[PDB]
Design a protein around this ligand. Structure first.
Ligand SMILES: *C(#[C])C1=[C][N]C(=O)[N]C1=O
Ligand SMILES: C#Cc1c[nH]c(=O)[nH]c1=O
Ligand code: SF4
Lengths: 1004, 1016
């Protein structure tokens, strides 16, 4: 046979494989019009009817992210200085920091940052109108690809933390309870269990107050988050999770208790011994209109305060223990108003079975004040919009609404709004829902607030800085004060008030508080995890340190690094006076190792920098200063001399005398290629000083073990592995290099740093640790996260040096690294999370980060998410929602119980070197335990990359269906694993144990 | 000495905005936050009812426009899908996967060539295609949160770069010379109307070789609706001219002033004058009217879209007319009737004419608007009002002017019938009324001129939808006139479809057949004639790109298909004698972690623990004979490995030579000895062993052979020199870098083999090792000049290939870039290399970096207005500063109005090479002169960073990098977030390296005195 030619059935498998084209393609316009429908992904501009949504409370948010999408979007964020997104967030979330933690896979640290400034952090990620807040300030709006999805990233990190099932703990900076001053036992009352009071009580509990009670009128908690925000935007379980975190702090909630003249009043609270009160009851009554007087729900009329709680009680399991039906809303529905409630009524009316929904408002389109993302949900669900119409009468016949009568409105040219009585509309309708807003009108509630002053708008007046009412022991915030338009602002109101309630209460007990407000952060048991490590007789408070490099150019820089939390730092390499150098410029350039991607996350740098231009005298005096001020932070002096015994002894003694904890010998800036020279330099230093010292090894050697062993034989206490890899980062198209120095545009070979060299450094660390067991290793080379640091610890290193990740960012990454490592170690003790990979939950089947419904009629039926297959999927899902309208839904636990460690939290010493047991020769690998690839069709996005890679880099083993674009791995798979390695969807392809007989393909 | 390790007051102040770790939650009142939010605002303000001023502002408003930075990022995001659904969804069937692959590889010429091969109006279509209803509507990435690819903006970008290159289209180089074309190709061909349909039809007919093609156009201008109605702020007129001039390069003639009409041109007159075929592409030339508008005039304020949009076009498109046309004075309230796509262009154009308010009023609902959402969004963001369910009944005229329109309300039934409620009326005040009810063909003289073709019930010419032939076999039609096409691209496609069957018909009239498979030619320029062959070690390569010995050459059948795709050469997978048979483990090839958790296209590395080929020496040797018999001009190199044994190397190398291999490659990865006498375990790490192996092979065979070096050596030059001393004809530099790609959080490796989850060190490949391979190639090339080098290591484009050629390599092996994609990248590499060599001869493009134009000051890839009162005024693009920028721009648009001069759109003349096009051999090693020792670098000629404030996006990354990795030399303003480099800059270049905007920071020669910081 012709061995170099595909047989017919392989040619058939390859039918859809890309080929070079020699001619232009003929396809008629008519044929193209038909074929278009088969592949269609997005909405069809010619489809005019709603997709059937009855009883469908699936998540419809466009911002929801799965892990794959969250990691991509978090790496895209520029992580800006003085970031304007944060300036535009009402609770001042450090967005730069929490997104940095997501990009480093440290979802705990991200969640901790979010909840530190916003105790309703998951609710807000889900519901914030970010285009009018943080996202509206995002610098990336000035790029074509646009602003960052801050809300979805916040939601993703908080959802992971929620799944971790870790409790909030008492502020660990507080004295123990029995030693708290008496003032912290003051009785505190909050009225209403909505976002404002939940925030306020949370922050007061952080400060140490131990007798905090929220009094809630209803039998459910959460306020509007629970009673009106739809389940398909905010799942009820999110609310319960945030309330559970608050109860972890000891806040008490009593339901069925109202602020009202005949129940709880300011006077009764005072007479019962309460020292302070926060009013957070919101706006409990609908704004009503005379033209709807006397109309009942049976006739077809609702206010939004009637309608949305009925829908929420029916669709939110565990909200109201009873199980309620969805309101029967069939026919034509008119929603009146154009605020944000109106759009929730319209989308909710479709879930109750409406046939058609009209939003009717009395001004124009340009005057809609709902945020665009709110408007777009109603738009994409085919709601009709009628502007410039003011309601006049509701027509009732046979006891039911049949029509609403409107008059036309218009702006004259003083901007006044007029009604035109001769211009009427008779609009047919079966249901009418007014969404005119909300008010506080109940006289008995307002009287219970005597004697605080009310303003023009019938609302309690507060000082906007302190949230204090006219009575100094009473504070208010949230919707009842009338400034907040959002959950996040109501949260911020309670946060703001908590500091000044604290101030007031302390003063009442004769105590002062700081002139600078200081609210505590959010804490969990993770934060108590010990990440110290001992190596070479030195105690490191944490294992992260600054490498000898550009971030240690000056000792003032090291000072700020220690103030930020870094466990240790190297000096830039310095030398004796006679070895003074002068750097050239340019000398540090970005890596080309991952394509033309600019900004954050450069995968490498190249430098042609020399030793420090600052003198030994500068560096020795600086080390003395640093060790005087930061005795617990390890300072290592990096030094270099030429091959000369007297010089190495002189310089090492000078650095030792300054107080350096240890020295690092730069042999890798060559002496460091030759084991005999390395051994001799180490011997000279070992005879000169008594402090530990480490030889910094170059990776540019045939066998790095031979030079590590030489350093050890010379008396080094350990080795730093490794310095930069020698390289050339490339050329312009005209041939000139970058960096190009001087008029001659000259360069020399440079050192490559960053994540591109991590595989080389990991190899070096493991091979040294296997050759020299127990010999201290300081790792450097691409460490940019707690998880990558843990890879080096697992590989045998004891501490972790960082350069490029700081060049890509700033010193504050240390806080991400420390919280992330604490979380990785903590999670190893949780038996329930043992199937996670570090902080990543096991991937579930998802499309666009939303779980695929587990419906029998959808599985295995080869229905991809496009064209007529998508139409079939939507019909199947809709029928299953109707089927579910007849059945019980369980309750969640009245409230979940946290996971508890079932074994000790590992210390760093317990994880060092644990990867080495899996490392060996090729002959120690099984060739009989073979694997094959298997594709989860429900996660596939139909790109064919697995197919293209098996075709042109593999075994032609994948069928790619010409109609569904679904791949199937066949039995000729060899398990090479290339398809998994190119698939864009994390864990869509998995390698599984081969079950059928295996025969290597010998071609012969 | 003071405290050296503390910042002085001046530096503490510079560091004021530097990020710091917080120990406490931050207190900020809700009221203060409300008052601060406005300062930073970037996007539209939902509370703003107030459309900013747009009079005489014809600047690009498209959301899809891309600059180079944005285009590269978006092209790398594309999955480059097999059997791609976006292409299925494009009416001209563009190979979107290929052209976007080219853009990601910086080959903008190859992208534009692929675009224009299937669409001669590719730049126009990139700008105006309603992609959400076409290609983008099918994009697989719609199934991700980040969403579908901006295909149109990518197409627009590549085409814009190609337009800037100023390269002409050439006659199809596959044709015989003109004088030996058959007589049939001189048949006289007429096209009626110079719109997209005819321009496309004439282009493809000219590609086929027809030499007498004339388009007869009614008007004095050309381009059809693209010229006369699509607004300048969506489609610049110079785009239309550029595409017209490309077609004219093929010899097509256009005659303006001559109409298809009774008493002018008719099908009868064309026939009598000896035309053999005619294409009707006159569109729909007349407005759809409404009785209620009878007798109303422009002076009263009434326009159809066919009156209004050409008036705006004539005034705003320089080079449309000779008349400097005044913009229509459209002051007051404008009512635009209808809600198709024309109505929205009327609305936005009315604002450019000075309208105070625009109402878009339509007789159905919102759900019934047919316009694409892209088009609707532009009218909404410009604050047009939308009034649904209104049907016009009366235009009110007082004092010679429209003052109002009265409407009736509309309504749907049970039956879905639309009704009008006479008792429900709207009286809407207005100064101008523009009807956008569509277009028609209704002129009796024009239809008469088409006698006797058959017309359908819609008074349009009938065609066969597959052939575009009318009922008269010599007459074809397409575009708007046929009534199927709703877009420029479908009209282009109608002319494309018609050209093949016009060709078929004409050829048959002259007694000739055509192929049963339609074969329209591709698009060509002089770039495609560029020679990219190279000679090396006596071997002739037809291009310098070849498949490395790796997974893409697992089987000889794959090499066969790679040769069919265009690869110049290929290596076999390394093979060995029978006694050295191996068994691979699985898993064994994994993605790199070298650029973080980015999945899918463009993996920056792979790691593999793969062995030699599992297939026999007999398989490989027979395969090499077959491949060399079928592809004599494609070079096949047999890769072989033996243990350190003279008889084995001689036996295997002779076997491979006898099979007809052009050359051998010695894989020096076999272990020998123990392996750390300083020279490690593999034979390729010890110079003595390499020299001996090479001696053995040199004795055994007479064909050239090359030693494949490992980068895992202290001194690779010593191995290369040993191979040369042993008699090798060159070296392959380099194999993979030894590494461990990473560990799971539980400590297990990946790849993990077996239930034990074991691994061993693997080889790292891909762009992550390119700096290592480039250094290895360069050092060998400088130490052993003229010794042939085959480069390997992260080559994934023509641009990166040329870097290796400049560094001393002669040919270019590829593995990982094919693993990331498929064999067809070779097409991108070949056109890309042709284009790079072509451009070196073009003096006018010296300022470009390869195919990249010099970066102009931009925001979102749109150029910033060069306005004095706008430059250096510390006005970033947010908050109150943006609103001052908008005021300054609007005032300057007005000053450009009240003086209505300047109509000089340059006449387009292509650049000519001023020197010979370099061959491959002319560029090899030309970068090596810039290399040297560190002491050869000037420390006297220092640089500093300088920032272009107009390009900055205010992120402060330069500031943060200088603060915590540099010299604290940048001031970052607390209110504008604008950075300024101060005189303490050392030129280290880290800020430039982290800035997200290409060329926002530049390094310039230092002019002030320089002193190194010594700290003392
Ligand atoms: C010296 C000093 C060095 C310069 N650049 C590096 O990457 N490493 C060094 O050791
Ligand atoms: C045999 C063999 C090889 C396998 N993998 C590599 O990366 N390089 C080789 O040489
Ligand atoms: S890094 Fe670039 S874009 Fe960001 S502030 Fe600096 S100059 Fe501007």
């Amino acid at each position: 046979p012709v061995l170099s030619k595909d047989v017919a059935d392989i040619e058939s498998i390859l039918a859809l494989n890309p080929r070079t084209q020699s001619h232009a393609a003929l396809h008629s316009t008519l044929a193209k019009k038909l074929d278009k429908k088969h592949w269609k992904r997005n909405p069809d501009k010619n489809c005019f009817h709603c997709e059937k949504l009855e009883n469908n409370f699936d998540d419809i948010k466009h911002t929801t992210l799965g892990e794959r999408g969250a990691l991509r979007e978090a790496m895209r964020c520029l992580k800006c200085a003085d970031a304007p997104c944060q300036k535009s967030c009402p609770t001042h979330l450090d967005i730069k920091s929490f997104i940095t933690s997501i990009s480093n896979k440290n979802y705990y640290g991200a969640a901790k940052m979010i909840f530190s400034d916003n105790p309703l952090g998951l609710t807000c990620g889900m519901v914030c109108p970010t285009s009018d807040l943080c996202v509206g300030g995002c610098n990336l709006y000035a790029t074509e690809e646009g602003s960052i999805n801050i809300g979805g990233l916040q939601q993703f990190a908080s959802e992971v933390f929620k799944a971790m099932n870790i409790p909030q703990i008492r502020n660990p900076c507080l004295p123990s309870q029995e030693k708290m001053p008496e003032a912290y036992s003051a009785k505190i009352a909050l009225l209403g269990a909505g976002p404002a009071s939940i925030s306020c009580a949370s922050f007061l509990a952080r400060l140490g107050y131990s007798d905090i009670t929220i009094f809630e009128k209803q039998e459910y908690v959460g306020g509007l988050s629970t009673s009106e925000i739809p389940q398909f935007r905010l799942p009820y379980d999110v609310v319960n999770f945030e309330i559970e975190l608050m109860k972890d702090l000891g806040v008490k909630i009593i339901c069925g208790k109202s602020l009202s003249e005949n129940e709880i009043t300011l006077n009764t609270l005072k007479e019962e011994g309460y020292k302070a009160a926060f009013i957070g009851i919101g706006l409990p009554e609908p704004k009503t209109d005379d033209i709807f007087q006397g109309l009942t729900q049976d006739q077809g009329f609702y206010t939004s305060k009637d309608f949305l709680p009925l829908v929420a009680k029916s669709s939110k399991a565990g909200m109201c223990a009873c199980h309620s039906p969805l309101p029967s809303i069939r026919g034509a529905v008119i929603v009146l108003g154009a605020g944000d409630t109106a759009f929730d009524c319209a989308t909710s009316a479709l879930r109750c079975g409406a046939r058609r929904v009209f939003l009717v408002f009395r001004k124009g389109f340009v005057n809609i004040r709902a945020v665009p993302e709110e408007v777009e949900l109603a738009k994409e669900e085919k709601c009709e919009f009628l502007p410039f119409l003011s309601p006049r009468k509701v027509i009732v016949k046979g006891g039911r609404i049949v029509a609403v009568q409107f008059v036309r409105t218009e702006q004259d040219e003083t901007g006044k709004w007029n009604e035109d009585e001769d211009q009427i509309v008779h609009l047919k309708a079966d249901v009418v829902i007014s969404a005119f807003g909300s008010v506080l009108r109940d006289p008995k509630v307002k009287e219970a607030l005597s004697p605080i002053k009310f303003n023009r708008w019938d609302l309690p007046e507060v000082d906007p800085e302190t949230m204090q009412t006219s009575e100094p022991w009473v504070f208010a915030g949230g919707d009842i004060v009338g400034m907040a338009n959002t959950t996040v602002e109501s949260v911020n109101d309670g946060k703001q008030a908590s500091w000044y309630i604290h101030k007031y209460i302390q003063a009442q007990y004769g105590a002062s508080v700081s002139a600078k407000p200081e609210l505590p952060l959010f804490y969990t048991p993770v934060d108590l995890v010990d990440i110290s490590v001992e190596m070479a007789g030195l105690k490191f408070i944490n294992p992260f340190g600054l490498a000898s490099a550009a971030p240690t150019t000056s000792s003032s820089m090291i000072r700020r690094a220690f103030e930020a939390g870094w466990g240790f730092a190297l000096t830039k390499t310095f030398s004796l006076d006679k070895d003074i150098v002068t750097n050239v410029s340019p000398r540090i350039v970005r890596g080309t190792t991952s394509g033309p991607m600019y900004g954050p996350g450069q995968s490498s740098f190249l430098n042609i920098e020399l030793i420090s231009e600052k003198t030994a005298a500068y560096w020795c005096q600086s080390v003395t200063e640093l060790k005087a001020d930061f005795p617990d932070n390890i300072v290592i002096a990096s030094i270099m001399c030429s091959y000369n015994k007297n010089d190495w002894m002189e310089l090492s003694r000078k650095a030792e005398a300054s107080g350096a904890d240890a020295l690092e010998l730069n042999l890798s800036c060559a002496c460091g290629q030759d084991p005999e020279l390395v051994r001799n330099i180490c011997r000279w230093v070992r005879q000169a000083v008594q402090i530990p010292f480490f030889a910094k090894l170059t990776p540019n050697v045939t066998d790095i073990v031979s030079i590590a062993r030489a350093a050890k034989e010379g008396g080094a206490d350990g080795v730093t592995a490794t310095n930069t890899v020698s390289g050339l980062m490339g050329l312009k198209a005209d041939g000139t290099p970058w960096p190009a120095v001087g008029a001659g545009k000259r360069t020399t070979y440079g050192g490559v740093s960053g994540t591109a060299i991590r595989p080389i450094a990991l190899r070096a660390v493991t091979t040294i640790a296997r050759a020299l067991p127990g010999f201290p290793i300081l790792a450097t080379g691409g460490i940019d996260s707690a998880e990558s640091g843990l890879q080096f610890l697992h590989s045998g290193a004891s501490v972790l040096q960082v350069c490029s990740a700081v060049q890509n960012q700033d010193f504050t990454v240390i806080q991400d690294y420390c919280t992330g490592l604490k979380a990785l170690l903590y999670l190893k003790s949780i038996e329930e999370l043992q199937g996670w990979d570090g902080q990543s939950p096991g991937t579930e089947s998802h499309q666009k980060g939303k779980p695929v419904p587990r419906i029998a009629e959808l599985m295995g039926k080869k229905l991809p998410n496009f064209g007529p297959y998508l139409e079939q999927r939507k019909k199947i899902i809709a029928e299953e929602k109707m089927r579910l309208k007849e059945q019980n839904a369980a309750f969640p636990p009245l409230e979940r119980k946290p996971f508890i460690p079932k074994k000790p939290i590992p210390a760093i010493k317990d994880v060092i070197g644990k990867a080495l047991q899996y490392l060996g020769t090729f002959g120690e690998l099984s060739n009989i335990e073979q694997v094959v690839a298997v594709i989860d069709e429900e996660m596939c996005i139909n790109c064919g990359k697995c197919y293209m890679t098996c075709n042109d880099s593999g075994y032609q083993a994948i069928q790619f269906d010409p109609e569904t674009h679904l791949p199937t791995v066949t039995d000729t798979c060899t398990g090479c694993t290339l398809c998994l390695s190119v698939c864009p969807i994390i864990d869509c392809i998995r390698m599984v144990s081969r079950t059928t007989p295996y025969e290597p393909k010998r071609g012969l």
